[PDB]
């Protein structure tokens, strides 16, 4: 594939990946942008993955990962069936003919817009794993300051950006653009009640996730990545007996 | 386009082509290299562009742009019919399959090879335009150095890979490209980076475009200037149109120049 492809590939096998996407960043600004949400075309298209359960839909952020995008959440929503609704909403700009955003604010902006449209004034949880969770917590923040108060902010093995499958140029651009976005996340309060979950096992050779100013921090099973996979019925069972309480 | 062609273009129209070429370097880092020229597997193709004059064949060697490679002498070839042969010699690693020198050295041993085997000990005449004048130049080097004695030496339009120059140079450019050519141009722009005019036993002529490119506002100049030359002609032209339209006064002072030295 596209020379882009191929240094990613050879980056996470030598251990460059942090050279590989500031390169990609770097890429990314010569991407087409929006400036407003007014100019998408139409808002970000939400992904619904569990219907029928009633009660809030949970808005499943992505990441900012390359393969990022439903996945993430296709076995969190299968273990959710008849419990919880579960939506995706993905990145802007992952996709192709996609634009990138030129700045976060724009593109929460948009994000929020997109959200509150499809859930048509009914109480929605946001949520969010890894970048995911950084993602659905400036989106929440940005939705408090317009009033919309979140029913509740999930957010699973969240780290601080400053102190931490086939794929496509696309991808890997949004990638490094995304990165860039988030270089400067600091973990501002929401008003909104935050369950934080963070893994149980480490991923390879204290490394947990915190979050401070949780309304619970509850640990489980798993690793970074299986704790939404293999371990996901143990995640669901947790966010909903908790949703269940606040 | 791949997100490196689109990078390449939408930062020429946007005067940000240097930003480009630094990033695709970064990026060719990460393409398999040739270390000797025995991991090349087959050495430097060199292909005629005009043939049947006799005497030494002019070598030219490709520059390292986006449409470098044979096209830059095609008009240089056709008016010295008959006069003097050429012969291109591609820079390895902009075509697809080709892998990049690991340095500059492993690549000029490598030409220097192709070159020597190609001419057979028959006299031959290096000679390059823009980059290429400085491959060409680093070549005589690397030959001279190896006891190799190239009969002459054409620079066109040198400058030193020292900035707005490029940034214009690069817009007046503005055909296919693909991320292994861009690859290579970030390449061959790192490895050109500490080049220098070492000193050279063969004769130089050196040839420098009549009209500038772009605007330079600082008339007190833009001209490309050669310390060493044996003799310093002036051709009509612009940096490209030289190769060009005005290809065959270009071909003329060189075809004369060669009986002379």
């Given at each position: 594939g596209s020379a882009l492809v191929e240094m990613y590939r050879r980056a996470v096998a030598t251990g460059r990946a942090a050279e590989a996407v500031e390169v990609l960043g770097t890429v990314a600004t010569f991407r087409p942008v929006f400036?407003?949400?007014?100019?998408?075309?139409?808002?970000?298209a939400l992904v619904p993955?569990?219907?029928?359960?009633?009660?809030?839909?949970?808005v499943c952020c992505a990441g900012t990962?390359?393969?990022?995008?439903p996945r993430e959440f296709t076995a969190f929503a299968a273990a959710l069936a008849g419990l919880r609704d579960v939506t995706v909403l993905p990145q802007t700009?992952?996709?192709?003919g996609e634009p990138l955003p030129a700045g976060l604010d724009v593109l929460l902006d948009a994000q929020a817009d997109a959200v509150l449209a499809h859930c048509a004034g009914r109480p929605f949880v946001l949520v969010g794993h890894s970048a995911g969770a950084n993602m659905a917590h400036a989106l929440t923040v940005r939705l408090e300051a317009r009033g919309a108060d979140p029913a509740a902010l999930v957010l699973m093995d969240i780290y601080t950006p400053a102190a931490p499958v086939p794929v496509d140029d696309t991808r890997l651009t949004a990638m490094g653009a995304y990165h860039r976005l988030l270089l400067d996340w600091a973990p501002r309060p929401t008003r909104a009640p935050v369950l934080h979950l963070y893994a149980g096992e480490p991923a390879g050779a204290d490394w947990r996730s915190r979050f401070d100013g949780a309304h619970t921090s509850a640990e489980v099973p798993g690793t970074h990545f299986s704790?939404?996979?293999?371990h996901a019925p143990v995640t669901a069972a947790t966010v909903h007996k908790w949703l269940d309480e606040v």
């Open positions: 400036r407003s949400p007014d100019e998408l075309g139409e808002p970000p993955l569990g219907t029928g359960a009633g009660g809030p839909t949970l990962a390359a393969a990022s995008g700009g992952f996709l192709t704790m939404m996979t293999e």
